[PDB]
Design an enzyme around this catalytic site. Structure first.
Site, mmCIF file in Angstrom:
data_model
loop_
_atom_site.group_PDB
_atom_site.id
_atom_site.type_symbol
_atom_site.label_atom_id
_atom_site.label_comp_id
_atom_site.label_asym_id
_atom_site.label_seq_id
_atom_site.Cartn_x
_atom_site.Cartn_y
_atom_site.Cartn_z
ATOM 1 N N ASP A 40 -1.869 -19.964 -31.434
ATOM 2 C CA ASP A 40 -0.841 -20.535 -30.578
ATOM 3 C C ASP A 40 -0.468 -21.931 -31.044
ATOM 4 O O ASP A 40 0.713 -22.240 -31.125
ATOM 5 C CB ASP A 40 -1.205 -20.745 -29.118
ATOM 6 C CG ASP A 40 -1.333 -19.474 -28.305
ATOM 7 O OD1 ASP A 40 -1.232 -18.419 -28.955
ATOM 8 O OD2 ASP A 40 -1.546 -19.543 -27.047
ATOM 9 N N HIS B 90 -1.327 -11.759 -27.972
ATOM 10 C CA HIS B 90 -1.765 -13.123 -27.761
ATOM 11 C C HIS B 90 -2.413 -13.636 -29.046
ATOM 12 O O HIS B 90 -2.554 -12.890 -30.024
ATOM 13 C CB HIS B 90 -2.694 -13.197 -26.549
ATOM 14 C CG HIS B 90 -1.933 -12.985 -25.305
ATOM 15 N ND1 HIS B 90 -1.253 -14.011 -24.691
ATOM 16 C CD2 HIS B 90 -1.661 -11.864 -24.603
ATOM 17 C CE1 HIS B 90 -0.619 -13.521 -23.626
ATOM 18 N NE2 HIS B 90 -0.867 -12.231 -23.549
ATOM 19 N N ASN C 244 -4.742 -11.726 -31.139
ATOM 20 C CA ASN C 244 -4.229 -10.601 -31.923
ATOM 21 C C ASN C 244 -3.609 -11.083 -33.242
ATOM 22 O O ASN C 244 -3.749 -10.441 -34.286
ATOM 23 C CB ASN C 244 -3.176 -9.811 -31.139
ATOM 24 C CG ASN C 244 -3.694 -9.313 -29.818
ATOM 25 O OD1 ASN C 244 -3.321 -9.825 -28.761
ATOM 26 N ND2 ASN C 244 -4.570 -8.326 -29.845
ATOM 27 N N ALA D 17 17.803 -21.257 -13.526
ATOM 28 C CA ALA D 17 19.038 -20.579 -13.880
ATOM 29 C C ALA D 17 18.755 -19.120 -14.231
ATOM 30 O O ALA D 17 18.123 -18.866 -15.252
ATOM 31 C CB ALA D 17 19.681 -21.254 -15.054
ATOM 32 N N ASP D 18 19.240 -18.179 -13.402
ATOM 33 C CA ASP D 18 19.285 -16.767 -13.772
ATOM 34 C C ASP D 18 20.150 -16.607 -15.019
ATOM 35 O O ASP D 18 21.368 -16.611 -14.918
ATOM 36 C CB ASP D 18 19.806 -15.888 -12.638
ATOM 37 C CG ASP D 18 19.712 -14.375 -12.848
ATOM 38 O OD1 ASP D 18 19.476 -13.929 -14.002
ATOM 39 O OD2 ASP D 18 19.846 -13.639 -11.843
ATOM 40 N N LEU D 19 19.523 -16.434 -16.187
ATOM 41 C CA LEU D 19 20.264 -16.284 -17.431
ATOM 42 C C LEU D 19 20.901 -14.907 -17.529
ATOM 43 O O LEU D 19 21.613 -14.632 -18.489
ATOM 44 C CB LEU D 19 19.375 -16.524 -18.649
ATOM 45 C CG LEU D 19 18.829 -17.946 -18.782
ATOM 46 C CD1 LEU D 19 17.728 -17.955 -19.821
ATOM 47 C CD2 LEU D 19 19.952 -18.907 -19.142
ATOM 48 N N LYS D 20 20.609 -14.015 -16.585
ATOM 49 C CA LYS D 20 21.290 -12.726 -16.574
ATOM 50 C C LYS D 20 22.633 -12.814 -15.834
ATOM 51 O O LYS D 20 23.486 -11.964 -16.042
ATOM 52 C CB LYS D 20 20.394 -11.632 -15.990
ATOM 53 C CG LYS D 20 19.259 -11.187 -16.882
ATOM 54 C CD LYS D 20 18.445 -10.080 -16.225
ATOM 55 C CE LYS D 20 17.203 -9.732 -16.975
ATOM 56 N NZ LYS D 20 17.495 -9.634 -18.410
ATOM 57 N N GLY E 273 10.841 -18.573 -27.081
ATOM 58 C CA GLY E 273 9.594 -17.892 -27.403
ATOM 59 C C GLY E 273 9.497 -16.476 -26.826
ATOM 60 O O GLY E 273 8.417 -16.059 -26.388
ATOM 61 N N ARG F 40 10.374 -12.122 -27.323
ATOM 62 C CA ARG F 40 10.392 -11.134 -28.389
ATOM 63 C C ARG F 40 11.768 -11.202 -29.021
ATOM 64 O O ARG F 40 12.719 -11.629 -28.376
ATOM 65 C CB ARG F 40 10.158 -9.699 -27.899
ATOM 66 C CG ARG F 40 8.756 -9.318 -27.436
ATOM 67 C CD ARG F 40 8.798 -8.536 -26.118
ATOM 68 N NE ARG F 40 8.143 -7.238 -26.246
ATOM 69 C CZ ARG F 40 7.297 -6.696 -25.395
ATOM 70 N NH1 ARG F 40 7.180 -7.079 -24.147
ATOM 71 N NH2 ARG F 40 6.562 -5.728 -25.837
HETATM 72 C C1 LIG Z 1 -2.297 -19.556 -17.465
HETATM 73 C C2 LIG Z 1 -2.885 -18.735 -18.626
HETATM 74 C C3 LIG Z 1 -1.971 -17.950 -19.600
HETATM 75 C C4 LIG Z 1 -2.095 -18.237 -21.105
HETATM 76 C C5 LIG Z 1 -1.460 -17.276 -22.120
HETATM 77 C C6 LIG Z 1 -1.802 -17.499 -23.600
HETATM 78 C C7 LIG Z 1 -0.618 -17.470 -24.611
HETATM 79 C C8 LIG Z 1 -1.014 -17.016 -26.021
HETATM 80 O O1 LIG Z 1 -2.272 -16.858 -26.263
HETATM 81 S S1 LIG Z 1 0.553 -16.716 -27.190
HETATM 82 C C9 LIG Z 1 1.124 -15.211 -26.343
HETATM 83 C C10 LIG Z 1 2.546 -14.999 -26.193
HETATM 84 N N1 LIG Z 1 3.073 -14.370 -27.350
HETATM 85 C C11 LIG Z 1 4.278 -14.821 -27.672
HETATM 86 O O2 LIG Z 1 4.794 -15.741 -27.017
HETATM 87 C C12 LIG Z 1 4.998 -14.139 -28.801
HETATM 88 C C13 LIG Z 1 6.440 -13.788 -28.435
HETATM 89 N N2 LIG Z 1 6.582 -13.373 -27.047
HETATM 90 C C14 LIG Z 1 6.258 -12.152 -26.651
HETATM 91 O O3 LIG Z 1 5.740 -11.337 -27.404
HETATM 92 C C15 LIG Z 1 6.620 -11.828 -25.207
HETATM 93 O O4 LIG Z 1 7.426 -12.875 -24.662
HETATM 94 C C16 LIG Z 1 5.346 -11.632 -24.331
HETATM 95 C C17 LIG Z 1 4.505 -10.474 -24.874
HETATM 96 C C18 LIG Z 1 4.515 -12.921 -24.350
HETATM 97 C C19 LIG Z 1 5.713 -11.225 -22.896
HETATM 98 O O5 LIG Z 1 6.575 -10.067 -22.963
HETATM 99 P P1 LIG Z 1 7.652 -9.766 -21.816
HETATM 100 O O6 LIG Z 1 7.207 -10.328 -20.530
HETATM 101 O O7 LIG Z 1 8.051 -8.390 -22.183
HETATM 102 O O8 LIG Z 1 8.859 -10.778 -22.100
HETATM 103 P P2 LIG Z 1 9.916 -10.680 -23.268
HETATM 104 O O9 LIG Z 1 9.957 -9.351 -23.912
HETATM 105 O O10 LIG Z 1 9.766 -11.830 -24.201
HETATM 106 O O11 LIG Z 1 11.311 -10.814 -22.464
HETATM 107 C C20 LIG Z 1 11.354 -11.673 -21.291
HETATM 108 C C21 LIG Z 1 12.438 -11.213 -20.350
HETATM 109 O O12 LIG Z 1 12.745 -12.298 -19.457
HETATM 110 C C22 LIG Z 1 14.156 -12.442 -19.401
HETATM 111 N N3 LIG Z 1 14.438 -13.826 -19.057
HETATM 112 C C23 LIG Z 1 13.938 -14.956 -19.656
HETATM 113 N N4 LIG Z 1 14.295 -16.066 -19.063
HETATM 114 C C24 LIG Z 1 15.083 -15.636 -18.007
HETATM 115 C C25 LIG Z 1 15.764 -16.342 -17.005
HETATM 116 N N5 LIG Z 1 15.724 -17.666 -16.888
HETATM 117 N N6 LIG Z 1 16.448 -15.612 -16.086
HETATM 118 C C26 LIG Z 1 16.460 -14.276 -16.199
HETATM 119 N N7 LIG Z 1 15.853 -13.505 -17.096
HETATM 120 C C27 LIG Z 1 15.175 -14.256 -17.984
HETATM 121 C C28 LIG Z 1 14.648 -12.018 -20.766
HETATM 122 O O13 LIG Z 1 16.020 -11.795 -20.548
HETATM 123 C C29 LIG Z 1 13.769 -10.795 -20.987
HETATM 124 O O14 LIG Z 1 14.234 -9.683 -20.250
HETATM 125 P P3 LIG Z 1 14.406 -8.181 -20.834
HETATM 126 O O15 LIG Z 1 13.594 -7.238 -19.990
HETATM 127 O O16 LIG Z 1 15.899 -7.951 -20.749
HETATM 128 O O17 LIG Z 1 14.138 -8.034 -22.315
#
Ligand SMILES: CCCCCCCC(=O)SCCNC(=O)CCNC(=O)[C@H](O)C(C)(C)COP(=O)(O)OP(=O)(O)OC[C@H]1O[C@@H](n2cnc3c(N)ncnc32)[C@H](O)[C@@H]1OP(=O)(O)O
Ligand SMILES: CCCCCCCC(=O)SCCNC(=O)CCNC(=O)[C@H](O)C(C)(C)COP(=O)(O)OP(=O)(O)OC[C@H]1O[C@@H](n2cnc3c(N)ncnc32)[C@H](O)[C@@H]1OP(=O)(O)O
EC number: 5.1.99.4
Lengths: 359, 359
Positions: free
Chosen positions: A156, A126, A129, A59-62, A83, A85
């Site tokens: 995590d 991650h 950090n 589902a495109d949530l946009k 999960g 930001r």
């Molecule tokens: C396979 C190996 C990988 C393993 C990775 C290890 C994981 C770890 O160690 S924990 C690390 C993750 N940290 C967290 O989860 C903390 C909170 N999250 C964050 O800080 C961020 O989500 C982060 C840094 C992980 C990624 O940042 P980023 O890609 O900027 O995404 P985020 O800012 O959360 O926003 C996601 C975007 O997707 C969009 N989106 C989400 N779902 C949908 C959807 N279904 N349809 C359309 N858009 C969507 C949101 O609308 C948002 O868009 P926008 O540009 O408008 O703000």
């Protein structure tokens, strides 16, 4: 669905790390977990086993319709996990207040690293950090060397997904008496600090120092560390209690009288040299046999690939076979309403189908 | 009592490690937690801040009076936590079957390392032992050295107490339908295995090997690891995603065109050498400044003693002061039914006065 959480309904907005893990355990314990992903990343039967016990919808949530379809799921559900930001769900029109309009009973579960507000709240991050900032990472590894990440187990999962779960389920209990949902703000930097509360306690009573490698539980104690054996494999020793420690020495063939005292820290280097020489004189499996059925707290250190051959693992079914190989069975275990073996991640299903099912 | 678990009544048979930590958290979130210790091992007001949010009572469970007073409290409680070897509570007349006859709503939470059955079920152990058998310990540390214990974070707490909590709270949810309690069997060897489910998934799809120090999240990746700075302190780098990695490189003053590709593993030695030299050229606090408000995934590795001066930690009140030392505030956080600051350990109370208070 088998398990104590039968009939719990959970919508997961797809992210990475803790959120998916929390969602998994809910699924594992028999909850009905619907994962909303974006159509762009979905290509076939997803082969990440962390997505077991889920129905995957795109589902495109946009889009207006993807939003609408999602708010209809959330209206039919007990728990929402996100999960992203801070601000992200709000701008999608999926924020806590929008959700409360269509369902005042929702447990609204926010999984971040840094928290909902504050100077770092928009910083990417991650595991490594979140645990650097709160003392945890500095404390892990040998003293003569830079800190080593304990995989991503501590920020995590341990201090992250698990506190999200404790919050989701405590909020469900509170709701039983209040009629109402609420918001759970689970920050990895907070959860991991509670996870390590024992060190903060010990530091207050002068029983823990900030020196890496100089503590009872950090590898600095000769009786709580790994030792290399004659075959180059390892054992782990965790004989904190003096009685267990004594049994270990006897089994090593060492006369306690010729050794420094267990807890004379100034003589720890000397004690360790003596234990190192003893463990090095036979192979790992030898020590495993010698200390079977003892309280000496000495166990073989198995690599992932050997775990399926360990009697105690086989006989409790800690793992089940799947896919490429073994995966952990749900935890914990329940006497009456037992979890069942996880369902693999199935093909994408259509979000309307799910709405029919939940009407 | 503040928090979502207000009204939950908990009886804790005093132990060590996970069982007290789980009990602490329940108390942290509002539960009414009563801890039965043996009189043998009590003296005045405890200094162990893990025993916050607690009433302490003493009772020789071997005696007839003790056993009966314990069974009275259990009759009036929602949850029992015990962390003794299997068979101990049975032998003492406080086993699940005995409790069930005085309170069939009881959640009977059993916290062990090895489990209630199998060949190791009677062996003593600590965290390092339980994580040694399921592949976890072998995976922690540098490739050229023996495994290093991640303190007691992974087996005791993350894979132990936290699963205990999820089982308690999941079972409480189930009791809302059934009207019945049950036994929760939380074993650290199982909990910690689920905590590391990610690695088991990635192993199956060839994306994780059994070689220590040669994976993405164990320190093997130059962009997920710590780095020594000019002052001998450290930063953490977690720049997994290419866009964050790019931001880090820019901050370091390295042009992408002079480096090997971020994920060309054959050239990780070169890349590590380049990042090492760059990070070594300024002190930690320099890097912390450069990269504040950035997505570069670079953060200072703080020692316990420095945490209280970090702005983001102060502002979110991740910690509170208590007895010549900071301590973590409860996690997670709740919008409507917020937790309060923990109450410190108190002097023992009379077991009668508790029965009176509870009716
Ligand atoms: C396979 C190996 C990988 C393993 C990775 C290890 C994981 C770890 O160690 S924990 C690390 C993750 N940290 C967290 O989860 C903390 C909170 N999250 C964050 O800080 C961020 O989500 C982060 C840094 C992980 C990624 O940042 P980023 O890609 O900027 O995404 P985020 O800012 O959360 O926003 C996601 C975007 O997707 C969009 N989106 C989400 N779902 C949908 C959807 N279904 N349809 C359309 N858009 C969507 C949101 O609308 C948002 O868009 P926008 O540009 O408008 O703000
Ligand atoms: C800083 C130092 C702290 C170290 C913290 C780190 C802990 C970790 O890393 S994990 C914790 C250890 N492992 C576990 O807890 C797993 C399950 N528990 C165990 O394996 C065991 O309790 C263990 C090994 C810790 C201790 O073993 P042991 O002391 O033999 O106790 P156990 O066999 O469980 O029995 C407890 C005894 O206390 C007695 N007992 C308990 N409460 C009472 C009471 N109130 N009154 C009378 N007797 C009592 C029981 O009767 C029993 O004694 P006996 O055999 O003589 O009847």
């Amino acid at each position: 669905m088998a398990g104590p959480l039968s009939g719990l309904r959970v919508v997961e907005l797809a992210g990475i790390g803790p959120g998916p893990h929390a969602a998994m355990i809910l699924g594992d314990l028999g909850a009905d977990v619907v994962r909303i992903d974006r159509p762009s990343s979905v290509d076939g039967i997803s082969r990440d086993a962390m997505l077991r016990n889920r129905r995957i919808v795109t589902a495109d949530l946009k889009s207006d319709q993807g939003l609408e379809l999602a708010l209809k799921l959330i209206a039919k559900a007990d728990v929402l996990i996100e999960g992203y930001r801070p601000g992200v769900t709000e701008r999608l029109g999926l924020g806590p207040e929008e959700c409360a309009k269509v369902n005042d009973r929702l447990i609204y579960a926010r999984m971040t690293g840094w928290g909902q507000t504050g100077p770092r709240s928009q910083q990417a991050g991650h595991d490594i950090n979140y645990i650097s900032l709160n003392g945890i990472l500095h404390a892990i590894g040998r003293g003569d060397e830079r800190p080593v990440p304990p995989l991503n187990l501590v920020g995590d999962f341990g201090g992250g997904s698990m506190f999200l779960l404790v919050g989701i389920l405590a909020a469900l209990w509170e709701r039983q008496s209040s009629g109402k949902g609420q918001v759970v703000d689970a920050a990895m930097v907070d959860g991991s600090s509670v996870l390590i509360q024992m060190m903060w306690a010990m530091r207050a009573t002068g029983m823990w120092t900030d020196t890496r490698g100089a503590n009872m539980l950090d590898g600095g104690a000769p009786y709580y560390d790994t030792y290399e054996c004659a075959d180059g494999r390892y054992v782990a020793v965790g004989a904190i209690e003096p009685q267990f420690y004594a049994a270990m020495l006897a089994g090593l063939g060492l006369d306690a009288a010729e050794l420094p005292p267990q807890n004379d820290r100034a003589r720890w280097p000397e004690l360790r040299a003596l234990l190192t020489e003893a463990f090095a004189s036979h192979d790992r499996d030898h020590w495993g046999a010698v200390f079977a059925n003892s309280d000496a707290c000495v166990t073989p250190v198995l690599a992932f690939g050997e775990v399926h051959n360990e009697p105690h693992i086989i006989e409790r079914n800690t793992f089940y076979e799947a896919n490429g190989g073994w995966q952990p069975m749900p935890a914990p275990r329940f006497s009456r309403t037992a979890s069942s073996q996880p369902r693999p991640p199935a093909a994408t299903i259509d979000i309307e189908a799910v709405l029919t099912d939940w009407d």
